[model samples]
Target chain A: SKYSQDVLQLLYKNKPNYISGQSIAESLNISRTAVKKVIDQLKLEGCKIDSVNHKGHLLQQLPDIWYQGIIDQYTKSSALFDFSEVYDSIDSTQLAAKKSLVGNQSSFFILSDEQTKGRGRFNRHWSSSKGQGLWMSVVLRPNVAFSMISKFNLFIALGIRDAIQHFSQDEVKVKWPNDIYIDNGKVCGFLTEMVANNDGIEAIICGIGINLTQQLENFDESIRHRATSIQLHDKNKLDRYQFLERLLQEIEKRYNQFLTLPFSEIREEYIAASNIWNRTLLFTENDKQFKGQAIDLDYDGYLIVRDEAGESHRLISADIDF
Target chain B: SKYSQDVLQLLYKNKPNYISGQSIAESLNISRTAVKKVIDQLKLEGCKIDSVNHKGHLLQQLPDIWYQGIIDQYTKSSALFDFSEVYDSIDSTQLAAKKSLVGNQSSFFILSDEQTKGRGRFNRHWSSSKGQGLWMSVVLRPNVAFSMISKFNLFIALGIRDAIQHFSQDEVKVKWPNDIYIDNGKVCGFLTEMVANNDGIEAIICGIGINLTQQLENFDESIRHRATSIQLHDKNKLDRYQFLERLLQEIEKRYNQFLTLPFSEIREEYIAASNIWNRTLLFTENDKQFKGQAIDLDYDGYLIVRDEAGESHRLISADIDF
Candidate 1:
């Protein structure tokens, strides 16, 4: 165990560079055979290692787990990540964020490699298999009104989309509210739990789950057709550590921009980024299903639609398929 | 201790009917002096009793506390009160409700006689002295959209006003969102905390604080001029137990109506019961001050105000004085 830990620590310490087997054995005070055995074990446990030209071993990726040390190394310069926490597995990041954000003054984040009991909106079960996706919840204590709260959907969705696009030149679009889509297959979804009084919002736990490397067969039968992942389209394999850093930075920039700018100033950008407008949709409300054309958003971000009867409807909530 | 509890139990059992001192002494197998002492002690402990024409002692009220027995007696037939809990004192009923509502299905209630760390909107300290007010939070798990959430203000404020008016014939009005005003002085306030995801609302903790018997001097110095109580206005001595029943009934009726009817159906009634329409107001938003006339509510219950500069603004939130 010590050799494994020491060897992994050494690899993490000198990432993106190859380390000679003799040097690793000397550095860890172990035999070369021991070093080779540890490397084989780590490789079997999902660590990505490249041994090219018989030169040395290059650490490409660690095993599927979130480590505080790795997170700290990446987010050391970020103010938003100052209060970050990492978990190997959790029941739900949103629930964890909800507990930790009480009586708190600053924003923070919670990230996990797996969620034992992940949940989407309405407490629906969300599949979060280990080593499959990026599961995180951002606890934001914004001094904003309930009216301004809806804009967070746009800010976070756009921020995440921008980060994904930047990483792999992939096409991403925001669905009606905050679902992330790549060519009509849902790639990500967000759950926002708001704590507030009558006057204003106190804290918001913005939970985001991105299907990073999950194959189509890994998803549940019901969601298989609708769900997808970034790995399916991207040409190069994603480094989760690097990707997480950029994701957090983009979110920080977008959230800061949201605090200063009026919704009117960024409304057009969000509209252009979303894929819902001008599309035909089948929606259910109050046990009645209707066919409608998605039109626009009201000032408060409520989706406005025109039904088959040519009557306009402003939907507060709906179950839909498009 | 048993004698004291037995004496109180006897008084409760025969409320509104005087039991002669001699009869009480005989029933409890105690001397007349012991019965007299217990009655005096109970009176000293804040029980209200009447010795009418020296016939006997009538139990007018119990000590200034909420007991589970008393609550059960008052709310036995109420479906809304089936999951109720009573506390003698607490930090905040809202906090308690927040913790208890997680993973819960049916609605429930938390009632306290005093709150040592009482909080209003914005976590502002609210004075909740013992024997002075009704402190309670109702947790409602409504299946509604974010758009319909604002209507809870009208539903609760109108429900409380209706109950207050029914009890005392007092002229009560809703102040804009959800504050309850009695003749220009605030007698009640509500704080609503909603737990929701992007899909729809999961639960709402509606915390209400009603100033029942507090004198003007009992209020904090900053709020004394703006605060008043039912005891200052009611001609008859109010019974907390009876009043709580009626209040709960009115809220139940109003909330059920809210579930079935659209905001448009009850908009006129709410407007008629509010004091803000067409009134002059001074408000602060974005750190800028403005004088305005309170106009109508938008479709989503946001206040529409016309500024002195002839510009109309839809306020999602504001700090205001009128």
Candidate 2:
């Protein structure tokens, strides 16, 4: 009902130069009461305002904090899902998204302040804490066949990497399948679940968990050596809401491209962002450890590897401790 | 429950002889009221019961009809899903089972007195009529990987084949991917639909549509020459309900074995009962028709075919025009 953000701009443009409320009302073509209402609402949302008698309002400083409304209004999100909500503290956002899917729900985005039991790609534990990271999941119902399901995971990784690149200048790479790494430390993870029938796909739910502000010391004891977050690279408070907004938008764009285009369209980007290509890596699958060279991601998204004896093995869903 | 069937058996055992109601009651160890109830129920069920005062009761003739109760009491039914219900006329019993699985139902089964759109493997139409054959589906949730799905279809074909053999010593044979043939004509058809997720299978509905009472003329003109039913070969009116019961028992027994044993355990039986084994056959796959010699059914249930140039092609789903 109000283009009230214009009021924040009017006050901010004249920072430290206090202006009359009546002057603000006239500039924005609104009443002084409406200006006061906007100021009060912004302050309630953690913004700072300084008022001097007869000098009107001065925008002292804007808060680097986030609210539900900021991210909810991030995009024309109706193109993806119905609605999104934020939680101060919750369990894994992936688990929350999974709950929505099992209940036959769609278009639900879950963002939590912390995850008590966040998990990684292979059911490995992910540590999250309040005001230290961003955790969210986007559950999309794609119409792709099962053979092409893995492509979606890779595409989503690219989208997240794009968003992270936008925020910080750190080099980001996608680990095979669904992990995003920065500075050789795990930063974000993606988990995708698909439901398929004899006819074809019923739905696909893709969840994302991000480490926005955690210090390496905050990671669990064992994985601490291999942990990093967006905050470490930025050296400032990260706008989690903005990160999610960008991530979702990028995902929707890439996913739309994925609908009509082949995986080859994003193959180069995936190759550039993937960490394991042409690298000798030690991987464990089903409790058996083996060494192989990670070669190429095949057309169908199978990780092609040439084991010893020059044998090529196209790997699908397997845990790699590489 | 009425002992009406016992009464009918007794009457048929002594068709020309007359027996007293007191003797029949004593033989069944029931009161005259219960015997009268059985007679009343059987009469309502359209069974012919003749009674003459002092001459006692006699089943003038036994009815050659079937109902849900008869087939439901077929097997202990624990191996697959749950109890089944028969529709007087259904679009397809497989369609019915498919609907149940999508609704997250487990342990369900459906049978139809007639199938209006009964389809065979690869969407081929199969003709069906009331009391013409057994059209049934077993919606099972097997804990098997996608790699082993085809084996379950073959095992089910073997089950139906076993049932047909028990009913008539017709020497029925499997015609790969999913069909049952006898005397070089198609007798039964199998269509299996499976729903799966990333982790594993959600459910699988396996349906069988058989041609029982249809004469050769009842078949479509194009394939009438290759069409055959259970009735033409058996001469006697094959009990449809008995076939279903026996089929269920066989499926349960074989499916239990399939759970713990590899496809190799049942490989020979499938090889022995399959039609195209080591035989020249014409198959249409992906709109390409070619001739190949069916050399082997590998352990994975793929139909290994050696094409004309001695090149081996491992086929998963293919239709034979032979």
Candidate 3:
């Protein structure tokens, strides 16, 4: 059988320099017509190439495809991938992981590009256009009680923050509850869904959406100014496959520690990475508004804030303005 | 239609007495062949019909069937049936409900007469023979946090206790955490499984199993001395369809109150129906054994036990010997 990938690899090796169609065919022991068909198919799958009448072909760019091939080549072996899968396009990786069958010994990971229906906290729409970000969900079946779920959420956020810091070389702080920020711009979002009962937790689907390669023009008009991506901060593109592998490694570490160690063991580090404490914020609780200075986090991960009246209150659920 | 139900109705009205084949045929406006076919079908479906040479047929007993026909005829109008279903035999109603499609506005219910693979708390095997007990699971999607799930468990136990009292006319008490007792013999078991996330609870499957008609011989040899059923106490069989409808009604009431009223409102009543208070019980906590008098139940439904050393301990999980 003829090999299209071999021909593509030849072009990649000699990019910006044209190769004659006849020369390419003789080197790969294929006809010139077969090479032309491969070029046409490659263009249709989002590759960019330049062909001239005299100059044969020059490779312009490669497609950012996330498939089993990339995962096998880039990701490190771990139990997290025992039940893993990748999709070219899907409604949401979060929904896929929630419905997927999982085992207790290992977790399940779902990765996708071009999510048509992504969701955030309180069912808000998360814009996930094609080939511009990292969309993935991990299914974890922990034996812990539901009261510890708040701390679990914080552990996940901190893991992602540390993962991005490996490549970003910039400050990344966890914006309490459901967001990660860099330079006061939202760089990531998280949604943790739990399926539990009186017996114990059945599963927790941790969905993380990292803005990896999006430019200023990729975001919606309303959020463009408030949102940022890794490319936007560093001004250089990142290999999504490598970034994802790094993310899975970091998540596995934090999850293992969450199960083995006490929450107090990591409480100080989480507090250090948090961006809310000592900062004045406006929020509403019980249909009443209050401007308070964030003070600390309780053992259950509840935010404690001092109101304007010098009274301290613990916040369970709130919408805070920074 | 052949109107076979009409023939069954006629037999029901004249139960304990023989009705001639010709009289049944003429009254139901059917031929003798159709009457014979209806009797054959009824016997196949578990009805006990005695046929004699000259005395014709006698309705010995009705089949304990839990089908859509019985639910429609016996159950009252409620939002519960919007997504309700009945099965002749299933692996487990809890498993069926967990995999079912449910909505937020209304709950889903799965009921079965015979369960081949039933389970109790902590994944223990539950014996659910055919046509002898009530096996049902209700899928509740409450907009409440997971911390209140302990109270939810108590509310469900209380609901089933009240429903059984409606028929048993005997004192029923909740054996803390997972069982219901009448005269110190186990009568019911509950399993509440929750599917939730950090955002909120997704759904809770309330699985209930009640021994309604089992005799001593029907129980396993090991549990025969400790297990008791409704028929064993009353010496008379009760209509299972009517008892199931009453159970659903009582459950709906308690669930509604659980959502609307504070746990404090129901605390006193739950305490009243509790059987462990002031009784010395042996239990193991944190791998240490302790013998204490079960003193009271806290708001979270945890059993507070005072040890012999006069130190009170709140039990979250334990194996208590009552």
Candidate 4:
């Protein structure tokens, strides 16, 4: 029964040219009436199917809210977002994606919904209320060398900024490593985990958390003044599925660009999207804090910062606070 | 039921010291009579239990053929091997270990009566008749730097050689990068697969296949002249469980050494165990074959060979045929 439903859905999505109702019924070993009932069910579910007098049926367009519609539009050539779904709550989407990647599944999708125990950099707990924000992660199995993994964070940041800009009139900027900002406030953050084998890259899990529909009560006392969301800033409630589709499409484009072009090409785009470039910010590393102006990012994704004493330090790991 | 059996086995193994049958019976929530029956069952299965009139019963030793006996002796310390069982036939012990590692199971200790679809280097099949060889693989999760993975392979080779020597009177030598040999014939081989993330090495599945009991039919036509097993050369069938216990114990010792010591210290041991040093052999790489004298191995595990034409090449992937 499930197989027939899946087959019927596939046929309905690809139709402009019709498949005979008898063909569908015989293929699934079901009666013609059953096939017709399935067709009726699709129509009720908001699929645009045009039924001719004697001809089978023609598909016009899919419902925008459905995952298939988003996948069709987002994955233009060969869909990178092969799987996309919403979960009720998960311990960590990054962990789930990591498990899938190790099992040899293609890491090329996103999982969104509520997170009961979400995590961030250095095992910090990310506060995500149910349906109040975009809690999503991407699974990627890249075959690049281990030295090149840091560039993935930069690529994701640039991709997220472009996707945010598609829906808003305001400017969106990136913070070093993996954070997105709008109007000097944090809007989105991401986590990237990779698995390697003897030869090279095995897989990567990238978890992106965005505040989409956050209210004032969503933030903790410490970050209350610093965090903002799309629904909080704009009166319009952006369609969640539409936002996801656009974001996945942007990620696919940037990811392809990353594989094809040299680091310098992406470097220009990353610098343009970064908010701290030439801005004075407080950076902390190894229990020492200092004020510095972000100068340049190296080819290897190292952040080059010039401190107040006019000394430049290449930071591999540090926390930046504005 | 499986969980209760496992608990009973643990208690029986630690008997004689008085595990307090009350603690065991209450912890498992089974009646004391049920626990006593389970203990009686283990004794019937050839376990020696020492009981005093007033003092509780104590388990002295298990049957040499029993899986619990091998597990008890091998996993007494850090407990590397979680499950050890003798199977009738297995597709691939390496593959089984890899599956467990991917499932987040720390390690696997498997012993097969025969390997129907055993695999070796370059994807070649190595078949063993029933009870003709020692088939095992260990899964390790190590958060190491990417460059250090090859070093893990070298350490595995050294550990295997040390293990085999504990059983044999003859000298055991490593044939650079994989195989273990005794007097110019192969005895054992090692395969290491790493699971990596963006930072570095996440886990490594290290497989060791040894030929303990030998039969003429166990050898393929190509390697019949070159491959030799313990029973073939020594005219004896070494105890399977005893051999496994020693091998696993040696692996634990070497692995701990690897985690603590620098690569430089282990490199010396690896060089000493190599059989190909100063020997003229034909090595093939990237579909090109060449004759060369194995001169040295670099710190990074690359084979340094001096060719017949007075030129040298560093080989990252190649097959050596003597």
Best of the candidates, DockQ: 3
Q: What TM-score does candidate 1 get on C-alpha atoms?
A: 0.75
What's the best-to-worst order under lDDT?
Answer: 1, 3, 2, 4
Using TM-score as the yardstick, the better of models 3 and 4 is 3
Give the per-residue lDDT digits (tens) of candidate 4, residues A176-260.
8778888866888887766553444656678899887777677887898888786665656576756876787788887887677
lDDT of each: 0.78, 0.71, 0.77, 0.70
Question: What does candidate 4's lDDT look like per residue over B80-190, in tens digits?
Answer: 666555565777776666555543546656666667777765456766556667777677766566556777877778889887887777888988778889886789877
Isolated chain A TM-score, each model:
0.83, 0.79, 0.78, 0.76
Stretches of candidate 4 off by over 4 Å are A1-86, A102-112, A127-129, A132-137, A151-157, A183-185, A220-236, A279-295, A305-322, B1-76, B79-143, B220-226, B230-236, B280-295, B299-322
Give one digit per residue, the lDDT tens place, for model 1 in A1-322: 5677667767777877888788899997789988889889888978888876557888887765676656656556677654777887989888788767765566888988899999886567888888888999998877876545677776777888887776655678888675888886788888667876556677777999988888898998999989888888788886777678788888988898888886666677778887887768888666688899878866656778899889999864455677
Question: Which of the two, 1 or 3, has more lDDT?
Answer: 1
Please give the lDDT score for candidate 4: 0.70
> lDDT tens string, model 1, B1-322?
4476567666777876888888888988998889889888878878888866568988887765776655655556677655778888888787788777765566888899888888876667888888888898998877776545678767777899887776655688888775788887788888777876556677777989988888898998898999888777788877777678778988898888778887777778888888887668888665689899878876666788899999999865555678
Q: Scoring only the second chain, what is candidate 3's TM-score?
A: 0.80
TM-score of each: 0.75, 0.58, 0.79, 0.73
The DockQ value obtained for model 3 is: 0.35
Which RMSD values do the candidates have, in order? 7.2, 10.4, 7.1, 6.1
Model 1: pairs clashing at backbone N, Cα or C within 3 Å: none
DockQ values of all predictions: 0.30, 0.11, 0.35, 0.29
